[PDB]
C-alpha cells in the first residue's frame, strides 16, 4: 500500500492526475497535448454548466491537482 | 492510512473524486470555444488547436480515479 501511495503522490506532484478543481472563477483552457503513451489528449479544463447557470471552466492545477482538490473538499 | 485508502475508495465509487478521462484524439461532437459550453455535466475540456474549439469528456460517474489508474497502467 505504501508503494501505491508513494506512486500516487508522485503522479500528483508531476501533474499526471487531472483532478477537477471543484469542491465560480472562469479560467483559461489551454491547448490539447497527448500523453506519453496514447493518442488521447490530456485535459486542461473542468468546464461545467448548471441547468440555469453559466460556464465555469476552471483550469486543472498542474502542481498538485488531487492534493488541491482534496484540500478544497475538506475546507468546504 | 488504511482507513484513508478505504475512504478514498468509497468516495471514488460514489463518483466524488473527479479524476477525468484523457480526452479522445478524435471526437466528433459539435462544440465551440470553452467559454461557451455548447456541450452540461462536469466535463474536462481542452482547446483543440485545429478548429479552435474545445474537446470535452464528462467525468466518469462510477470510478473516476480507478478508471484513470487502470488506463494509466494499461499504457
Amino acid at each position, epitope marked *: 500500500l505504501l508503494c501505491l501511495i508513494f506512486l500516487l503522490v508522485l503522479l500528483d506532484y508531476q501533474g499526471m492526475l487531472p483532478v477537477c478543481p471543484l469542491i465560480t472563477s472562469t*479560467g*483559461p*483552457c*489551454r*491547448t*490539447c*497535448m*497527448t*500523453t*506519453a503513451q496514447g*493518442t488521447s489528449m*490530456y485535459p*486542461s479544463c473542468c468546464c461545467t454548466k448548471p441547468s440555469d447557470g453559466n460556464c465555469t471552466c476552471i483550469p486543472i492545477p498542474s502542481s498538485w491537482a488531487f492534493g488541491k482538490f482534496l484540500w478544497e473538499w475538506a475546507s468546504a | 492510512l488504511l482507513c484513508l485508502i478505504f475512504l478514498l475508495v468509497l468516495l471514488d465509487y460514489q463518483g466524488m473524486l473527479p479524476v477525468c478521462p484523457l480526452i479522445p*484524439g478524435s471526437s466528433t461532437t459539435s462544440t*465551440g*470555444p470553452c*467559454r*461557451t459550453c455548447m456541450t452540461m455535466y462536469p466535463s474536462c475540456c481542452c*482547446t483543440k*488547436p*485545429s*478548429d*479552435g*474549439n474545445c474537446t470535452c469528456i464528462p467525468i466518469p460517474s462510477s470510478w473516476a480515479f480507478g478508471k484513470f489508474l487502470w488506463e494509466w497502467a494499461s499504457a
Partner: antibody
Amino acid sequence: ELQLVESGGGWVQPGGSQRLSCAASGRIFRSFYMSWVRQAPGKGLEWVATINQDGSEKLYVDSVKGRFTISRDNAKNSLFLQMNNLRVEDTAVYYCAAWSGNSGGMDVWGQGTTVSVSS
Amino acid sequence: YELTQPPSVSVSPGQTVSIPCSGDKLGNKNVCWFQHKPGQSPVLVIYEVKYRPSGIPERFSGSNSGNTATLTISGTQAMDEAAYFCQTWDSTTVVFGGGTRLTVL
C-alpha cells in the same frame, strides 16, 4: 523549454519544390500540434499548415491546398513542410510553431527560413 | 473569413492604447494576440480572449465585445513597438489579422 530551428529555406525557381525542416530541441515536441505560418515580405503573418501529434490530422490553408504537405518525425523530433509546385507569392519567412499545453495558442516559434521563390 | 485591424496606431511614451480587431461573430471565437517585432519570431501575447501566457508582462490585456476583439496595452513602453496580429479560427483554418504596427513616439 522547447526550441525550434528552421532550415532548408532558400531560393527556388517558380514551379519548383522545397522541403523546410524544423528541428526541435526536446522530447515534448511529440506532444504538441505543430504548425507552419508564413510572413510574406511587406505583409503580415499567414497560416500555412497544421499537423496533430500523431500526424493523422493535417490541415492546410486554401492557398497551398494540395501543393504543400506537412509531416512530422516524432522519433527524430522534426517537422517538415514539403512545398511542391511553388509560386511567386510563396516567397515568405516561414516559422514553425508549437501549440504548447501551457497556452491556448502557438507560444513556441522558430527563427524562420526565408523562402524566395522567384526567377 | 476576414479580420479587420487598423494599419497602425499611435502611442504616447507612457499612455494606454487599444488595438481593435473586427470580425464576423468574434464573440463566439477565441482570439489570440501575437507580437511580431521586425526581425524576430512572433511572440504570443494573449492565448485566449483575455488570458496571457507565462512571462508576458501584466500590461497587456484582452477583451472581446460583440464582433470586436481588443488588445489593450496600459503603460506602453518603447519595447511594445511592434506589429500585433489577432488570430482566430474560421472553421479549421487559423486566420490572422492584417497587422497593427504599434508606434510609440
